[PDB]
Design a protein around this ligand. Structure first.
Ligand code: VX6
Lengths: 265, 33
């Protein structure tokens, strides 16, 4: 069959500054279909030692088919580059929305949480643990629907539990901090951290030094602002359990009365 | 390297919700004996 070639795309502007300077608005030439096209340089990958991570990320995310998970339609490479052909989400990152808004009302947060739980639920039915749930790894499409975007730390854990410390400081589950093995319940932890950052504007274990944040995550030392409503506290508290075994199932999140009372049709 | 992945690199006709089989790839990879 016909394989992708760069020549199949018209390339427009970078989608983003900084760490995203890398991903372009793109167009498939015949269909005129708008895409994001992520460009990676082989030599810099191979010098960094991260090329096997890439393999895993592509293999995983290109096989996942869900409304709230950004399609990776395909990839290809040439002498110098690897290209990832990704779904374009025109409304940008949840993180930008949080920056713009400061914190989200209850309806929006519950809707984001519903959408997201649905995506991870489906992910977990596949034995995939995401392992990097956080506002930047989340994108918004046309209708403002949530899509999971970054599968750079995700793993297919079909049988064996995992040892790899990965994720983002403020979102690390306690089992990772303490160097114990971990399973899919990490995503439940980070979900609770996220639901908190959504409503408050900052994550619950924020500290000056990472040393001090590690410690607060392990002791589960955090507090809620007065404005956080009882149902939101309950949910967050349920998700933020030191013992991963104590964390709810995603179907439970989806059926939580704060979530149901607050998410949309 | 092997930039040869167990992943789609075939041209897609974008100009036309169910390609259901595709994610079967997970349980099959788990089902590898
Ligand atoms: C891949 C992708 C990106 C998009 N959409 C956008 C959109 C965007 N915009 C900037 C802000 N205005 C409000 C409109 C949208 N800015 C970025 S900047 C950006 C770029 C990439 C990523 N994420 C990734 O590359 C994920 C795959 C690892 C996040 C933000 N990405 N659709 N699909």
């Amino acid at each position: 069959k016909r394989q992708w070639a760069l020549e199949d795309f018209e390339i427009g502007r970078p989608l983003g500054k900084g760490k995203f300077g890398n991903v372009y608005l793109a167009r498939e030439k015949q269909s005129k279909f708008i895409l994001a096209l992520k460009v990676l340089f082989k030599a810099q990958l191979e010098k960094a030692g991260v090329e096997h991570q890439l393999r895993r990320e592509v293999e995983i995310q290109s096989h996942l088919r869900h409304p709230n998970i950004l399609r990776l339609y395909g990839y290809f490479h040439d002498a110098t580059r690897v290209y990832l052909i990704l779904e374009y989400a025109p409304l940008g990152t949840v993180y930008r929305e949080l920056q713009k808004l400061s914190k989200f009302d209850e309806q929006r947060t519950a809707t984001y949480i519903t959408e997201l739980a649905n995506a991870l639920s489906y992910c977990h039915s596949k034995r995939v643990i995401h392992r990097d749930i956080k506002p930047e790894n989340l994108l918004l499409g046309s209708a403002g629907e949530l899509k999971i975007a970054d599968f750079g730390w995700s793993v297919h854990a079909p049988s064996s539990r995992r040892t790899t410390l990965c994720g983002t400081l403020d979102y690390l589950p306690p089992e990772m901090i303490e160097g114990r093995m971990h399973d899919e319940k990490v995503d439940l932890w980070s979900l609770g951290v996220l639901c908190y950052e959504f409503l408050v504007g900052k994550p619950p274990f924020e500290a000056n030094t990472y040393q001090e944040t590690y410690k607060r995550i392990s002791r589960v030392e955090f507090t809620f602002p007065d404005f956080v409503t009882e149902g939101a506290r309950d949910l967050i508290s349920r998700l933020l359990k030191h013992n991963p075994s104590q964390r709810p199932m995603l179907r439970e999140v989806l059926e939580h009365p704060w979530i149901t009372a607050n998410s949309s049709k | 390297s092997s930039y040869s992945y167990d992943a789609p690199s075939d041209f897609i006709n974008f100009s036309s919700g169910d390609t259901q089989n595709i994610d079967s790839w997970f349980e099959e990879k788990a089902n590898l004996e």
